[PDB]
Amino acid sequence: REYEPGQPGMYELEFPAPQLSSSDGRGPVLVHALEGFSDAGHAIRLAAAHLKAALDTELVASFAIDELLDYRSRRPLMTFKTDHFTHSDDPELSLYALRDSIGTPFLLLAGLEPDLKWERFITAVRLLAERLGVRQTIGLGTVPMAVPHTRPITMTAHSNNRELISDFQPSISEIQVPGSASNLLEYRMAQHGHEVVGFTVHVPHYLTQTDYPAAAQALLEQVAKTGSLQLPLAVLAEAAAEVQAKIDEQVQASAEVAQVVAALERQYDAFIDAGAEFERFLAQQAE
Template sequence: MDEKSTLYELEFPAPQLADDEGDGPVLIHALEGFADAGHAIKLASDHLRQSLDSELVATFSTDELIDYRSRRPLMSFTGDEFTAAAMPELTLHAIRDNNGTPFLLLSGAEPDLRWERFVAAIGALSDQFGVTSVIGLNAIPMGIPHTRPSTITAHGNSKDLIGSLPRWGSELKVPGSASMLLELRLGERGLATAGLSVHVPHYLSQAEYPAASHKLLESLGEVTGLDLPTAALANAAEKVRTQVDAEVSGNQEVESVVAALETQYDTFNQAQQEKASLLAAEGDLPTGDELGAELERFLADHAQNEAATENDAESRDGDDKGDGAAG
């Protein structure tokens, strides 16, 4: 048996996931753990499975992939005996959007162990189902206020896939995750890959924050063309916003922190809009050759003006000397 296939159990029969034109599905991975601030990844993946037509494709062996000592499962105890254990799950589901378009959703606990074997297994499943592109979902804590719209940044090996979504824009070295390795290795296999990272107010990173999940699914629909349900998450986000506002109100220290974050958020957005406004006029800017020619003309004129100024100065000095001799 192929070693990587021992990491999962495949359901039988496997679903047919090609669309009407014969194209394979997009694979979305939503791994909880390392980058799931505000539980946005779990909320988003649970919402997709519960609100759309969903079919189990594969179940991964968490005994092979999870270090239970680092993330100990919760167990239920009655006072006399243990009655249940909430073991972590990692599954692959086939889901159809509101228009019936199929996609794959890999969701659950991020593996602690055997990342390369895990990625190889996902690569084999991607080949089996004809996956065309791969998109990872992440949620990271940031210094932003809950009173402003959620923001998102994107990255990936396909500019066509992530379109005009904001980028990080600078080189970084960051601690790795299974999600990041999936993006890297599947990209090396020739697939179009991308990652969407929603930003969660850092002071709410441990609470459920459905506004971030709503933004993730909106952006996911934008880059994939999938018609995904978001109304329930939007409603949940409004309720959480009301609750947080009530908790913040009257606490001067917290209010001042939120106000400072609002100022920072608004200043950054204004700067970005002004930059975009300047870039929008880029087509009317002079070319490099035109700028070079203009610079040469400027330097030539500047040299002529300096020469004329020197000649005038020498002429005045001569006149002064003549006047002095006459005196």
């Protein structure tokens, strides 16, 4: 009986570990992208998927999703063809090693946000990140906002190093937000002296429950910038513009909708001429 090494009931290591040292010889960036907390425009799913599809990807550790998942809250999708079941869409939670367009290795934590054992999960992710010499941890988030899809995508950034988010202008005072595994990971990681940064992309609220690839693009572009990675984005941008074109059509068809969007454009332009909405929208998504 062969025991596949790792941490029992948490993760299995995939052998062998990849090489994660750069040309300059410094540590990898770690990007985390967990679904189940706030998935407006399904931006997090699409961002992770693209990286995996568009880049060289190797499994480093697969987490014990079966021990972490509430299957009755999030039932796996099954396929039925005529008179029998033909496919099961199995949930995943994994740590990947990727290489960017000039072969710079980085790590990707992606899959379902676990329902259970956040602290054991997060301690495990940190230990792995430390063993692999992670220099910077980057989290992805989305949040619905009263913004149009016809104006540039906006984004709130958070970090424990103010130099890392100097391109941003914080419009938030002390607030209380529901926790996510990603946010708690970011925080626990910070309590241990690791450099963390996260980006929460703003998605028009009427697009909350559809694929909005542009949102993913914005996140990934920001990841490229902050982590010194070169990410092949063209296919995502292509898909993003395709969806944009289709959304324009559904609006220029319904006089009702267009006013809603136009009204949002008007308001968008006012803010540019220069927290509580963030708190209300996150709490709704967290349920």
